[PDB]
Design a protein around this motif. Structure first.
Motif, PDB file in Angstrom:
ATOM      1  N   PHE A   6      58.246  46.975  36.532  1.00 31.66           N
ATOM      2  CA  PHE A   6      58.369  48.260  35.184  1.00 31.66           C
ATOM      3  C   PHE A   6      57.681  49.101  36.032  1.00 31.66           C
ATOM      4  O   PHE A   6      56.404  48.881  36.915  1.00 31.66           O
ATOM      5  CB  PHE A   6      57.618  47.860  34.202  1.00 31.66           C
ATOM      6  N   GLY A   7      57.771  50.610  36.101  1.00 30.24           N
ATOM      7  CA  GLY A   7      57.372  51.084  37.146  1.00 30.24           C
ATOM      8  C   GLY A   7      57.401  51.917  38.332  1.00 30.24           C
ATOM      9  O   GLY A   7      56.634  52.561  39.484  1.00 30.24           O
ATOM     10  N   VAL A   8      57.781  51.031  39.546  1.00 29.30           N
ATOM     11  CA  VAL A   8      58.518  50.593  39.835  1.00 29.30           C
ATOM     12  C   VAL A   8      59.963  50.157  40.772  1.00 29.30           C
ATOM     13  O   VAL A   8      60.824  50.222  40.268  1.00 29.30           O
ATOM     14  CB  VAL A   8      58.035  48.914  41.248  1.00 29.30           C
ATOM     15  N   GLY A   9      59.961  51.592  40.861  1.00 28.00           N
ATOM     16  CA  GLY A   9      61.821  52.579  41.432  1.00 28.00           C
ATOM     17  C   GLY A   9      62.007  51.919  43.191  1.00 28.00           C
ATOM     18  O   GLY A   9      61.147  51.052  43.900  1.00 28.00           O
ATOM     19  N   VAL A  10      62.777  52.203  43.474  1.00 31.48           N
ATOM     20  CA  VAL A  10      63.409  51.785  44.656  1.00 31.48           C
ATOM     21  C   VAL A  10      62.906  52.435  46.210  1.00 31.48           C
ATOM     22  O   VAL A  10      62.301  52.465  47.089  1.00 31.48           O
ATOM     23  CB  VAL A  10      64.999  52.656  45.404  1.00 31.48           C
ATOM     24  N   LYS A  11      62.684  54.356  45.385  1.00 30.65           N
ATOM     25  CA  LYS A  11      61.375  54.612  46.743  1.00 30.65           C
ATOM     26  C   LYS A  11      60.183  53.827  46.857  1.00 30.65           C
ATOM     27  O   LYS A  11      59.999  53.657  47.836  1.00 30.65           O
ATOM     28  CB  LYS A  11      61.405  56.006  46.069  1.00 30.65           C
ATOM     29  N   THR A  12      59.623  53.540  45.936  1.00 33.49           N
ATOM     30  CA  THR A  12      57.672  52.830  45.726  1.00 33.49           C
ATOM     31  C   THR A  12      58.328  51.643  46.275  1.00 33.49           C
ATOM     32  O   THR A  12      57.932  51.374  47.268  1.00 33.49           O
ATOM     33  CB  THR A  12      57.627  52.905  44.666  1.00 33.49           C
ATOM     34  N   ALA A  13      59.206  51.145  45.611  1.00 33.27           N
ATOM     35  CA  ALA A  13      59.699  49.761  46.959  1.00 33.27           C
ATOM     36  C   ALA A  13      59.750  50.168  48.368  1.00 33.27           C
ATOM     37  O   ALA A  13      59.505  49.223  49.231  1.00 33.27           O
ATOM     38  CB  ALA A  13      60.427  49.005  46.385  1.00 33.27           C
ATOM     39  N   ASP A  14      60.603  50.939  48.720  1.00 35.52           N
ATOM     40  CA  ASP A  14      60.479  50.542  49.857  1.00 35.52           C
ATOM     41  C   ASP A  14      59.554  51.945  51.005  1.00 35.52           C
ATOM     42  O   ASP A  14      58.986  50.650  52.290  1.00 35.52           O
ATOM     43  CB  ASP A  14      61.855  52.056  50.284  1.00 35.52           C
ATOM     44  N   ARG A  15      58.900  52.308  50.317  1.00 40.72           N
ATOM     45  CA  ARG A  15      57.687  52.940  50.804  1.00 40.72           C
ATOM     46  C   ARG A  15      56.062  51.608  50.855  1.00 40.72           C
ATOM     47  O   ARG A  15      55.692  51.936  51.598  1.00 40.72           O
ATOM     48  CB  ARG A  15      56.966  53.558  49.438  1.00 40.72           C
ATOM     49  N   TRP A  16      56.603  50.988  50.241  1.00 40.62           N
ATOM     50  CA  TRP A  16      55.302  48.860  50.538  1.00 40.62           C
ATOM     51  C   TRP A  16      55.588  48.728  50.863  1.00 40.62           C
ATOM     52  O   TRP A  16      55.263  47.783  51.685  1.00 40.62           O
ATOM     53  CB  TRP A  16      55.659  49.000  48.613  1.00 40.62           C
ATOM     54  N   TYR A  17      57.092  48.459  51.002  1.00 44.52           N
ATOM     55  CA  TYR A  17      57.859  47.620  52.056  1.00 44.52           C
ATOM     56  C   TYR A  17      57.374  48.265  53.666  1.00 44.52           C
ATOM     57  O   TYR A  17      56.940  47.492  54.402  1.00 44.52           O
ATOM     58  CB  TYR A  17      59.123  47.974  52.128  1.00 44.52           C
ATOM     59  N   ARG A  18      57.615  49.873  54.115  1.00 43.16           N
ATOM     60  CA  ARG A  18      56.740  49.845  54.999  1.00 43.16           C
ATOM     61  C   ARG A  18      55.862  50.044  55.353  1.00 43.16           C
ATOM     62  O   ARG A  18      54.988  50.777  56.749  1.00 43.16           O
ATOM     63  CB  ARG A  18      57.359  52.189  55.192  1.00 43.16           C
TER      64      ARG A  18
END
Length: 86
Positions: A6-18
């Motif tokens: 909750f509170g984690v979107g596509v952009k945040t997930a991609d940022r964490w991936y990178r």
DNA sequence: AAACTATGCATGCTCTACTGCTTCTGATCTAGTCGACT
């Protein structure tokens, strides 16, 4: 996995991936870059992961009806969303 | 009569407060960008 938080979107997930976070543990390692929504989602991740059943829906509606009445009498509450679709 | 001493006063200097005006600074309201959600 990240999007389910909750509170984690596509952009945040991609940022964490990178940023090199490849598993849920790294998120809990540094609880300083997580906003209130993300902290709440991660704290109760397991509870929110389980699907909600109709019994919980009826219990929630029964609880909410009393609160709505206490706030004001004569108000009506309708259940919408996926549950309204069957 | 002359020399030394006495008081007396003035003015510039220093400090501390006091008041009022001017400028700088800290607290408080919104546009844009990114993101979250239904």
């Amino acid at each position: 996995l990240f999007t389910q938080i909750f509170g984690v979107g596509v952009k945040t997930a991609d940022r964490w991936y990178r940023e090199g976070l490849r598993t849920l543990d790294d998120l809990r390692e540094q609880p300083q870059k997580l906003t209130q929504q993300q902290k709440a989602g991660l704290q109760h991740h397991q509870d929110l992961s389980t699907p909600v059943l109709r019994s919980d829906v009826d219990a929630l509606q029964q609880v909410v009806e009393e609160a709505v009445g206490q706030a004001l009498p004569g108000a009506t509450v309708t259940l919408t969303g996926g549950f309204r679709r069957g």
